Amino acid sequence: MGKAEAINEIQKAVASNKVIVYSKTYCPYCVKAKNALNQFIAGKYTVVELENRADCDAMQDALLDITGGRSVPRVFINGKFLGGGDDTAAAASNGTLEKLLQEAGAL
Ligand code: NA
Ligand code: NA
């Protein structure tokens, strides 16, 4: 369960879920992203919490390789990285989160 495996896992999950958030339970920016998504699709999307993953470091290293940054949250829609918590809240506020969810078939 090293970094190469984590990259594999994340890429497969991102390609196979309309909306997926990599998160940790104690994380106010993760909550900002979740609350933004919950304005449109509460209860319908995947969250992967990382704080009790034995391979949490490899998973966050994999997120860096895939998205450019290591921090949670890391939000993906329709297989494409959206951003973190501020990004997801901004997209909720400006009308684009709804449109991206529609285009993904999640809404
Ligand atoms: Na969904
Ligand atoms: Na966990």
Author numbering: 1 to 107
Question: What are the paper's exact sentences on this?
Answer:
Glutaredoxins (GRXs) are thioredoxin superfamily members exhibiting thiol-disulfide oxidoreductase activity and/or iron-sulfur (Fe-S) cluster binding capacities. CrGRX2 is a class I GRX member that possesses a classical YCPYC signature with two cysteine residues present at positions 27 and 30, whereas a third, non-conserved, cysteine is present at position 56. In conclusion, using the roGFP2 as a model protein substrate, we showed that CrGRX2 catalyzes both protein glutathionylation and deglutathionylation reactions in the presence of GSSG and GSH, respectively. In addition, this work demonstrates that C. reinhardtii GRX2 has the capacity to bind a [2Fe–2S] cluster despite having the canonical CPYC active site signature that was shown to prevent Fe–S cluster binding in some other GRXs.
The crystal structure of CrGRX2 was solved at a high-resolution using synchrotron radiation (1.5 Å, CrGRX2red) while a lower resolution was obtained using a laboratory source (2.4 Å, CrGRX2SS). Both crystals were isomorphous and the structures were highly similar (root-mean-square deviation (r.m.s.d.) of 0.10 Å for the superimposition of 107 pairs of Cα atoms). Only one difference was noted: Cys27 and Cys30 form a disulfide bond in the CrGRX2SS structure while they were reduced in CrGRX2red. The equivalent distance of 3.2 Å in the CrGRX2red structure indicates that the disulfide bond was most likely broken during the synchrotron data collection. CrGRX2 crystallized in space group P3221 with a single molecule of CrGRX2 (Met1-Leu107 residues) per asymmetric unit. The overall fold of CrGRX2 showed four mixed β-strands in a central core structure surrounded by five α-helices. The four-stranded β-sheet is sandwiched by α-helices α1 and α3 on one side and α-helices α2, α4, and α5 on the other side. We found an acetate molecule originating from the crystallization medium at the position usually occupied by the carboxylic acid group of the γ-glutamyl moiety of GSH. The amine groups of Gly85 and Asp86, located just after two conserved glycine residues forming a structural kink, help stabilizing the acetate ion through hydrogen bonding.
